[PDB]
C-alpha cells in the first residue's frame, strides 16, 4: 500500500480528534449487535445478552478502547503497519481462528462510528483515506493465514 501526503493528513488530523475510549466502545458494541455471531469470541466478557448489556459491559468498552488504540498504532506508523500487527496477527490468526471477513466488518463499523462522531468533517475524501487504513489493517491482521 502507498499513502499519499493528503492521505496522511486526512488520517493524522482526524485520528487526533477521535475519542479513543468512546470510539472503541461503540465500534465493538455494534460489531456485537450487528454481527451477533462474533460474540462467541467474547464469552469471556459474559453479559452480551442484549444490545444494552453489550453497551453496558465494562470489558467490551475496555476492549474496544484497546482495539481502537491499536488502529492508532497504524495511524502513527503507516509505513510499518505490517509488523505492528504481526504479534496480533499471530493471535487472531493462529490462536483465535477469527475469520478474516470479520476484520472487514470491524473496519466498516469504525467508519460508521467515525462518521457518527465527526459528521461532515468526515469528508468523502477522508472516509476513503480511512476505509483504506482500515482495509490495510485488516490485511495485516490476516497476514498469518497466508
Amino acid at each position: 500500500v502507498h499513502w499519499s501526503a493528503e492521505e496522511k493528513q486526512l488520517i493524522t488530523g482526524l485520528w487526533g480528534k477521535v475519542n479513543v475510549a468512546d470510539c472503541g466502545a461503540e465500534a465493538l458494541a455494534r460489531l456485537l449487535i450487528v454481527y451477533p455471531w462474533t460474540q462467541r469470541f467474547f464469552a469471556s466478557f459474559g453479559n452480551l445478552s442484549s444490545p444494552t448489556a453489550i453497551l453496558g459491559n465494562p470489558m467490551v468498552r475496555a476492549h474496544g478502547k484497546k482495539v481502537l488504540t491499536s488502529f492508532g498504532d497504524a495511524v502513527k506508523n503507516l509505513d510499518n503497519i505490517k509488523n505492528t500487527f504481526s504479534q496480533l496477527s499471530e493471535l487472531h490468526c493462529d490462536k483465535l481462528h477469527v475469520d478474516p471477513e470479520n476484520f472487514r466488518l470491524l473496519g466498516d463499523i469504525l467508519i460508521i462510528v467515525l462518521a457518527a462522531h465527526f459528521s461532515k468533517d468526515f469528508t468523502p475524501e477522508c472516509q476513503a483515506a480511512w476505509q483504506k487504513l482500515v482495509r490495510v489493517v485488516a490485511h495485516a491482521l490476516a497476514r498469518k493465514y497466508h
Binding site: 449487535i33 460508521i112 462510528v113 462518521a115 457518527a116 472516509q127 476513503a128 476505509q131
Partner: protein, 141 residues
Amino acid sequence: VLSAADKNNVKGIFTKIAGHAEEYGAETLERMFITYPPTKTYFPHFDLSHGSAQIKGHGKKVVAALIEAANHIDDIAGTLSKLSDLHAHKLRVDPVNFKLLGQCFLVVVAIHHPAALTPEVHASLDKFLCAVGTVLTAKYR
C-alpha cells in the same frame, strides 16, 4: 427475514431519510466512487465530477427505490423486481458492490442523524440494505 423491530428501526431513520433523498443518495454515491474507485466502472456514461446532474438524478432514484422498498418491506422482491433484471442481468454487478453502497449510505446516515443511528437501528438498517442487495442480485441466484 426482518423482525418487527427491524421494520420500525428501518422506518424511523427512513422517515428522517425522506425529504433529503436527492442529496443523501448523491452523497452515498460519491463517497462510494471515491472510497471505492473501482465502482465507477459501472458508470462510464456518467460524469462523476462533483455534484453532477446524473449523480444527483441517479442518487434521487436509488434512495427513492430504497424508500419504496422501505414501505413495501413485506415483499421487497416484488417491489424491486425489474431492478433485479437491471442489476443482475443487464448490468452484471459483482455482488460485492451492493455491500459497498450499503456501507456508504450507512455513513451518510451516521453523518446526518447520529442520534438515530443507534446500534439497534444500525443493525436493522444493515439487514435491510442487505436484503435489498440480495434481491437486486437475486437475478443471478
